[PDB]
Design a protein around this ligand. Structure first.
Ligand SMILES: O=C(NCc1cccc(-n2ncc(-c3cc4cnccc4[nH]3)c2O)c1)Nc1ccccc1
Ligand SMILES: [Ca+2]
Ligand SMILES: [Cl-]
Ligand SMILES: [Cl-]
Lengths: 250, 58
């Protein structure tokens, strides 16, 4: 996160850290005790699935404070329509090996109903994006969880205001064109969370693209509303042997 | 009331029904109040609420 601030400990309780062989991979979003939403691209290069760990209740990576909860990942589910190393359909559903325990520091983000998301949430201007990603383009990653308020653009407006992969119906633009504020490498998979009448909801996933905080460009986010039904169906399904699962989309 | 407008007055989820009918609903871990619009937590850690903040104002 570029141009944000530290998310005070416990104020981003749905934020997940994904590690591979102990190394920072990506972010994620807790949506219930055993389910995490992330970005498909995070998993493009994974060799050994057994080395993938999700951490809840994380804040300051430099220390252990006892609020952290680590889990193995039992399943990584990606849409059939996702092509590695691209942007479209950049979403993943992760099943944890064991539930996290909800605490003051570990709380799921609400996965909204599609109708609600489309009719209401999509029109809330500002939303929060978070992670332990790069603090600057070509800079070091964050030791403390960062958060940033970004405004959402209608796709038409995004295109106009821009000055590259396409912007599809499965994405949206948010942020700033002035190169001051963005999500960045290390943040992918993390939440774009939207507040409505006292409750927060998952509306986007930090995806990727062309540099971070690049002048003339906006951040690209996976449009979660397009995937609600897909996610819900999967969450009702029994696990299958072998971590990686490609599931038909729609 | 219609769901497309002002969320049908619902705090959370909204369904249109046959007629000038509407039903609000709430996410798991919440219940709908008698106003037919408001949602109240039924569990300690409902989704999309920040405990340290909820407490900060409790
Ligand atoms: O290498 C793979 N995936 C492996 C992977 C794992 C974990 C993180 C990454 N990764 N790299 C850059 C970014 C990134 C930039 C960026 C800018 N703004 C906002 C968010 C952003 N995220 C990112 O999240 C890639 N895929 C791949 C490639 C090329 C060809 C085929 C597949
Ligand atoms: Ca820590
Ligand atoms: Cl099944
Ligand atoms: Cl496997």
């Amino acid at each position: 996160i570029v141009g944000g601030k530290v998310c005070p400990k416990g104020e981003c309780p749905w934020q997940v850290l994904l590690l591979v062989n102990g190394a920072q991979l990506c972010g994620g979003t807790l949506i219930n005790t055993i389910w995490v939403v992330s970005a498909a691209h995070c998993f493009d290069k994974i060799k050994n699935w057994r080395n993938l760990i999700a951490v809840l209740g994380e804040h300051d990576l430099s220390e252990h404070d006892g609020d952290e909860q680590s889990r193995r990942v039992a399943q990584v589910i990606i849409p059939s329509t996702y092509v590695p190393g691209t942007t479209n359909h950049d979403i993943a559903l992760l099943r944890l090996h064991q539930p996290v325990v909800l605490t003051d520091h570990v709380v799921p983000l609400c996965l909204p109903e599609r109708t609600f998301s489309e009719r209401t949430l999509a029109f809330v201007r500002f939303s929060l994006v978070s992670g332990w990603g790069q603090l600057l383009d070509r800079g070091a990653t964050a030791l403390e969880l960062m958060v940033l308020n970004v405004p959402r653009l209608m796709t038409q407006d995004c295109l106009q205001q821009s000055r590259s992969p396409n912007i599809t119906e499965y994405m949206f633009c948010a942020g700033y064109s002035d190169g001051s504020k963005d999500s960045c490498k290390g943040d992918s998979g993390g939440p774009h969370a939207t507040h409505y009448r006292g409750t927060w909801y998952l509306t986007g996933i930090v995806s990727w693209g062309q540099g971070c905080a690049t002048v003339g460009h906006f951040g690209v986010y996976t449009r979660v509303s397009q995937y609600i039904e897909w996610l819900q169906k999967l969450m009702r399904s029994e696990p299958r042997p072998g971590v990686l699962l490609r599931a038909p989309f729609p | 009331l219609i769901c497309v407008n002002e969320n049908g007055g619902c705090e959370q989820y909204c369904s249109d029904h046959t007629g000038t009918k509407r039903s609000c609903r709430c996410h798991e871990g919440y219940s709908l109040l008698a106003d037919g619009v408001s949602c109240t937590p039924t569990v300690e850690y409902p989704c999309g609420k920040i405990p340290i903040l909820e407490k900060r104002n409790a």
